Design a protein around this ligand. Structure first.
Ligand code: NI
Ligand code: NI
Ligand code: NI
Ligand code: NI
Lengths: 122, 122, 122, 122
């Protein structure tokens, strides 16, 4: 297989509509679902040091609320997300974070809540 | 049998809380096409109340702008502003009471192609 | 998109290893998960009448425990499953059941438990 | 916070109940490759006990042949025979105590690529 890393950006004109390092604010989804899912807002603590890794996740989505963050993926390469940007990360995709703004705030929705993380041995 | 509980969180103001259909339009994150319909995620914006259920496993709303008031069978009326989130258990009976003209809300749901049923009140 | 209907058959030689109409026996998964998932064994009540349809499901898998059943899918066509056979059905795939043995027993694992079913209007 | 409960069912004998790693080998249903790793499902057979957890959302076992005894932090030791099922909550602490030489069990799990951790007993 592999699902594809899938990125969307918010068009700046209002179009697109049809009819140690971080701290976390919990939505309560983990407790509500017994850890089947988690959802939390991640904020940067106000560069440093990109590391290829993977997560033992089924579902994983990020939506940028404030600031900017640059990710890199084994399939699609480097992508810069600003507020309104979203990144769907396939199960276990090899990726890294390249850099982020000091005001970054991003919502993460994941399954399971309690995923493991492994550094890619290159 | 047993049911999960509708789970609401609000963003403190403050900045604490961190631990170290036809009247709407939709912007797709691409998660439906990325996952073959297992999941969907989209931003919903208002364009300037009927009890119902959805055939969903997972369903979460995160308010990006404005405000929206929902009502739930289990927990009653809930007013959400930016930063507020509502986890809606599978098939929970609920309705939307009112919203702001500037409402923007992210919805994450499994599956993408859920059905909606009006609740038989009688 | 679309994920692909995925069938496996149990090799008859022990290989493959590496190192109204129906009644239902519940595993308890629906109650345990608040309807996020369901799992139950379906048995035939001891022909009749194939109807193209879809289900509002994320995940859906069948594993045949006894007897045989012939399904048909919009993507892969007709497939006959015997004991040990499995069918992964993509979210909302158009399919039908063509015929089954009178002793059919099949395990279904689904998300959500409470999916809707729609007849395909042809 | 809150946790789902390990949920066991047994097949009545009778026929009622219907309502109208290195010591094992594995046969893949194809669900991992079909779903890009969101889910996996495989049949496990014995080849003729350490507390641990898995980083899984969904996890279900259905015994096809033989018997297997598990032990759970929440509900204790459980003996399963053919037709028995065990739903294992996300990350539940558990272990396998013993099994029959002819054990065959279907496992359905999300994600396919979960990690396993030995429980720190001290
Ligand atoms: Ni990561
Ligand atoms: Ni609704
Ligand atoms: Ni069907
Ligand atoms: Ni285990």
């Amino acid at each position: 297989m592999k699902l594809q890393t899938t990125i969307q950006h918010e068009p700046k004109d209002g179009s697109g509509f049809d009819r140690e390092f971080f701290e976390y604010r919990d939505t309560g989804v983990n407790e509500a679902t017994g850890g089947m899912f988690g959802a939390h807002v991640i904020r940067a603590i106000p560069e440093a040091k990109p590391t290829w890794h993977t997560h033992t996740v089924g579902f994983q989505l990020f939506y940028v609320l404030r600031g900017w963050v640059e990710f890199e993926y084994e399939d699609i390469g480097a992508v810069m997300l600003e507020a309104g940007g979203s990144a769907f990360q396939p199960p276990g995709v090899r990726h890294r974070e390249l850099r982020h703004s000091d005001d970054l705030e991003v919502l993460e929705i994941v399954s399971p809540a309690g995923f493991a993380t492994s550094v890619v041995d290159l």
